[PDB]
Amino acid sequence: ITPVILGLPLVTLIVLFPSLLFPTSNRLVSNRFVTLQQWMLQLVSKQMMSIHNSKGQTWTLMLMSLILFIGSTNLLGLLPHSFTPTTQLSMNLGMAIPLWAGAVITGFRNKTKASLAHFLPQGTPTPLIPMLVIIETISLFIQPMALAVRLTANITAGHLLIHLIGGATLALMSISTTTALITFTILILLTILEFAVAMIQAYVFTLLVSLYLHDNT
Amino acid sequence: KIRSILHRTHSDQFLVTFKEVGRRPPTFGDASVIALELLNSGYEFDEGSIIFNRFRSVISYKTEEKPIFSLDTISSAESMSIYDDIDADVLRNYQEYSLANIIYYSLKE
Amino acid sequence: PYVLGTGLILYLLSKEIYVITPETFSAISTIGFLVYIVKKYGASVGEFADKLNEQKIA
Amino acid sequence: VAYWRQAGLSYIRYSQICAKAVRDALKTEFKANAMKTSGSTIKIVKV
Amino acid sequence: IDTAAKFIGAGAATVGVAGSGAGIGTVFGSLIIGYARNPSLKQQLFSYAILGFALSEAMGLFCLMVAFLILF
Amino acid sequence: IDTAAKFIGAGAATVGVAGSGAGIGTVFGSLIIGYARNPSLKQQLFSYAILGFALSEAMGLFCLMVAFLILF
Amino acid sequence: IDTAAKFIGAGAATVGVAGSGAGIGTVFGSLIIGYARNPSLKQQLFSYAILGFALSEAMGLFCLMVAFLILF
Amino acid sequence: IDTAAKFIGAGAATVGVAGSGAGIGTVFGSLIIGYARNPSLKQQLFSYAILGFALSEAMGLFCLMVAFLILF
Amino acid sequence: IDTAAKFIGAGAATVGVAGSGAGIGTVFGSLIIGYARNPSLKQQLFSYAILGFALSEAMGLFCLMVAFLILF
Amino acid sequence: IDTAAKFIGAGAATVGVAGSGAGIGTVFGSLIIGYARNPSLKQQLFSYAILGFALSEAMGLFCLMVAFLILF
Amino acid sequence: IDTAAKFIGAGAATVGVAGSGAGIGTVFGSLIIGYARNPSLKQQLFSYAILGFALSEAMGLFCLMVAFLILF
Amino acid sequence: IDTAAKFIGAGAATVGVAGSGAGIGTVFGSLIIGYARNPSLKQQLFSYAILGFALSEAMGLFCLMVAFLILF
Amino acid sequence: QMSFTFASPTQVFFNSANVRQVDVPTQTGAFGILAAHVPTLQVLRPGLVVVHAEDGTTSKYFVSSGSVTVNADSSVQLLAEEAVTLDMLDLGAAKANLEKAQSELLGAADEATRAEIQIRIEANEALVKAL
């Protein structure tokens, strides 16, 4: 009970502080504190907005909340362990519905039978051939929404292996270090090559897909 | 002598003006030289026309005029693009090259 | 900067408390974190110029 | 433009260094003629 | 045999993820050599980069569905 | 044996979807290079890209048919 | 031994279609990028893409006949 | 074992036609992009595409000889 | 059978790393033939190469976790 | 066991000719588009094609040397 | 069973090193056509080619470690 | 089991030479489509072709040393 | 079957001449343009002009630079800057110039200068090519 119950509020709370702080910054104070923290949403409104609009002002800020949430949630699975093999997997499955619901909000809710009428009328799906539209509805929604859960789970898998293989290498060669240090030095560097790259690209995927919907809607 | 009548009605709307056109007769090089200078002067990209006396016969020329093509913004886009299978660089570096060619020609004309 | 450093420290402790947490898992991650710091402090200074000056100007 | 807009040079300049180099080269009788035919003989004189 | 072949059959469908991972290397490659030609980087080309990486990862998510079905 | 080799054969046929996955990337990649050369994006070239994704998924549906026949 | 090995024989023979699907993506891509350079589209070149998508599927019908031989 | 390993072994040798299948689409693909650059179609270029489909189906004929050696 | 075919099932799941390895060669090759056109080294072409080698070894981490599931 | 695994193991080494056959379509295809830009047909270009296919089918003759060493 | 299928599990893990070998040519071959456009040899392209040789042979190192895992 | 699995374990490691087979065709093929753009054939390009063919037969010097370890 | 207009300021070498090919040291890469050729302008390298005239001829030139202008239709206009028959070019100079060049390069500090120098080198070299 406690362990799972403690986890979800914590993921919420880390996202909450930045989201409270920026509204506050609009006249006081600032001292050291407010200006330092203000930089967080300044990086969000700097980096992500280079792609947005695109789909227009209306839908922009709604999506940016989730894009930040996904990246921040993975960062709160980076440093904690044990965490990846169980707690992060339960969080990937707890984030699964939001990712499936993200297409529903505008696509399937207004048109279940042909959500591609909002997403992409002419493109990947052939408008001349209604058969291919329904076939490629899986490749453009049903399946990509399952892939978005596997997308965070691929980071979970590569991050987990670093640590399991670590664990097993120092357990196999408990020399202090010694030969295991050579392998373990590589396994360290893999955290940047794996997580820090793949975590960024993960919320890029959510960005692009949720643009392609609302831009043609 | 261009600017000797249109010297007399403009002067610093010219950038430079050239003699030795007469008093010994022009060369291509020269055309390239001017071709070069035309560019750096950002009047380039405000388009021009190139007006010269196009010879017809000893007695006559018809002052001819063309519009500038040394702009890579002609080398840009347009239907111009659709006549291409090559990028607006080596095109643009023809806008260059041709400026000399024509300029020479016209100059001579 | 100090608050963030405190926040990270707390999270690392919560991790270590978590039931399974072996030396090897931890050593990889802590080194993985450590590498970032030295770059990060130089980055935090370099970052600094833009936004608060850009705010002040605008 | 490897340097014909990327280290200056125009097609004009580039080329002109070429011709110039050709003039630099070539045999001399021809090089006399250089300064004649297509040898720059602009006199940059505003008027 | 009845329990053995499911394990040997899950790995064999995981070899069908070698076609999706190189088909993403060709689509993103020809977009990296399709942006050097310039200039419509945003829209047109890189907007069809996710539209070309959707039909090419569609063969992987169907193959990793046949690999998971022999595991569960 | 008979209820065993059907699982170690239906999985090997999913390795035939490696050409359907890497064929979708190559047919779309050269379509992303062909539309980078301009200008007939709306029909003619990207219309033929649909006639190239079909003649490449046909060697992926015929391979997925043989895998489904050895599983059900 | 007799009933089993014929199921693990038409499964590895379906891994020969991994060329007929990717090679069709190579030929139809080269006709997608080829027609970009223009102008022989409704003749000459797209009439050579049908002669290419057949020779590629020619090792996709020869391989498919072996998987249909081991089964029935 | 004697009739088993020759029935599953003749299936693994049919994965050698995946090379000749995609290798035929490329030699007929570069001839589609080559005749796009024009114009020596008959003779020289399209006469070399036969010399490129023969050296590619030579490994195919070498692979189809192996699968027929364990089948007969 | 149980403590056997999972050791030969992790071998077949490691064949999926032939697409994450040959997809990186296709990606980090077109960003070398595209930078030869120049001059978008930083911020544009190599920045998209980080997002090109992110969806290339993503099919490989999904293939390295499939073999890790058939071992631990 | 000593003769059975020699018939199904000589079939897995026949999949090593998939590289010599797809590589031959790349060594001749990149020679078709090579002489398309022209003009050194005899000598230089086609001479380099012979020294390339010899280094492409060498991984086919050595792979058929490990195939025939398992059956003869 | 324990000693048997560990030998046939390392062999299929060595087939995952077929992506690095063809990845090595498609990454050091695009740089063999990059310097053909010239003149960034020992500057930008040949420097990134080593950063392209490392990203592809690592997917050969992460596959040879699975082959060494099922051997010691 | 011990001697039986050493025969179908060096045969699956012999199909790893398909990456070096087509990788040598992709490397030497790019050099044939490079010297066609001319003229730095002697040194620079063909000298770099000996650096790319060695880095592609390097995976061939690690895959043929694997199958030769399960032999004697 | 190309109307080859080969001209330089100084000369028209071929003028809409039924040339079968011109093998072109267009900055591009070796390309042997026959006949009509797509509207494209491709700018010319210093090289040789080899004028495969539709008749076995290849007329020789060294070309300094210039542009090829490939006009959709049958016509090619090689507008070569200084494209000279190798006859009138000077081998002795090519090397000598190249040494000299090598001397210059060093002082061809600034890429624009270098550009010219490397060009010169390239030139002299290019003179060394055929001369």
Numbering used by the authors:
A (entry chain W): 10 to 226
B (entry chain G): 111 to 219
C (entry chain T): 1 to 58
D (entry chain I): 1 to 47
E (entry chain K), F (entry chain J), G (entry chain Q), H (entry chain P), I (entry chain L), J (entry chain O), ...: 2 to 73
M (entry chain H): 15 to 145
Publication text:
In the mitochondria of eukaryotes, adenosine triphosphate (ATP) is produced by the ATP synthase, a ∼600 kDa membrane protein complex composed of a soluble catalytic F1 region and a membrane-inserted FO region. In addition to the rotor, the F1 and FO regions are linked by a peripheral stalk composed of subunits OSCP, d, F6, and the hydrophilic portion of subunit b. The proton motive force, established by the electron transport chain during cellular respiration, drives protons across the FO region through the interface between the a subunit and the c8-ring, inducing rotation of the rotor.
The state 1a to 1b transition reveals a bending of the peripheral stalk towards the top of the F1 region near the OSCP and F6 subunits. Fitting of all available atomic models into the density map is shown for state 1a (A) and state 1b (B). The different sub-states do not appear to have a specific sequence or represent specific intermediates in the catalytic rotation sequence. Instead, the differences in conformation between sub-states when taken together illustrate the flexibility of the enzyme, a property that has been linked to its rapid rate of enzymatic activity.
